[PDB]
Design a protein around this nucleic acid. Structure first.
Length: 178
RNA sequence: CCACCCGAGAUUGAGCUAACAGGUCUGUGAUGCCCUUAGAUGUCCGGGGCUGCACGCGCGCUACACUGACUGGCUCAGCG
């Protein structure tokens, strides 16, 4: 899934989906089988940095396919770990964490996300100057999705100063898109 | 646009709060002066005025009639 070839990456993603399907046939309860599947891939978030980004990308692809079936609270736990991985120096780990956060915001229910806007968006807030400037597109899209899904004034209140303008800039599009 | 083969590579990495004269609009100075039983129209009450009329400068209404005025019938609309 982090190979050089795009075809190999596509095949590895499809193979992950297929083995996730394969563990849905070895037991009676699907959720516990998916839990066993994840605890077979959980240690990869601990080893090498490229292996950490590998595991974050794998979890990102897995979260989009088996959205609710793995179990919401467990989702939240993984998101919390991604927040620690939001503190990484490497740009690949940060990019993979941003993609996972985007996929989670797309997938996860808004009522349970409301418990976790502050933590993940605080982890977004204290990222860096270089990290903010480089991945300004991903942060822009994430703040757009948070404004769609929650109160604009809430994200305004809990973010630091500079991001404020980015928020209102997004809100600016929210009048001309209509 | 999607998928696939070959190919090492069919996209992996680096760089790219500010400006608005596009509009709007009552926040910051231990801000300069002038006034503060000389109330930057002090509240209230009662009664007057706003219309008062020699004359100028001008819009309007009614008329000076006979192609008119008075008296009785007739049949006619449209915006709203």
């Amino acid at each position: 899934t982090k190979e050089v070839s795009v075809g190999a990456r596509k095949n590895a993603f499809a193979l992950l989906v297929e083995m996730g399907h394969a563990f849905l046939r070895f037991g009676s309860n699907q959720e516990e089988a998916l839990q066993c599947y994840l605890v077979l891939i959980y240690p990869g978030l601990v080893g090498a940095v490229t292996m950490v980004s590998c595991s974050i990308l794998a979890l990102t692809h897995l979260l989009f396919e088996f959205k609710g079936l793995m179990g919401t609270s467990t989702v939240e736990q993984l998101l919390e770990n991604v927040c620690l991985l939001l503190a990484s120096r490497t740009r690949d780990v940060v990019k993979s964490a941003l993609g996972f956060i985007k996929v989670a915001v797309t997938v996860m229910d808004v009522a349970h996300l409301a418990k976790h806007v502050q933590l993940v968006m605080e982890a977004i807030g204290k990222l860096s100057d270089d990290m903010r400037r480089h991945f300004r597109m991903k942060l822009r899209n994430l703040f757009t999705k948070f404004i769609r899904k929650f109160g604009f004034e809430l994200v305004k209140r809990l973010l630091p100063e500079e991001y404020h303008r980015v928020l209102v800039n997004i809100r600016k599009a929210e009048a001309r898109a209509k």
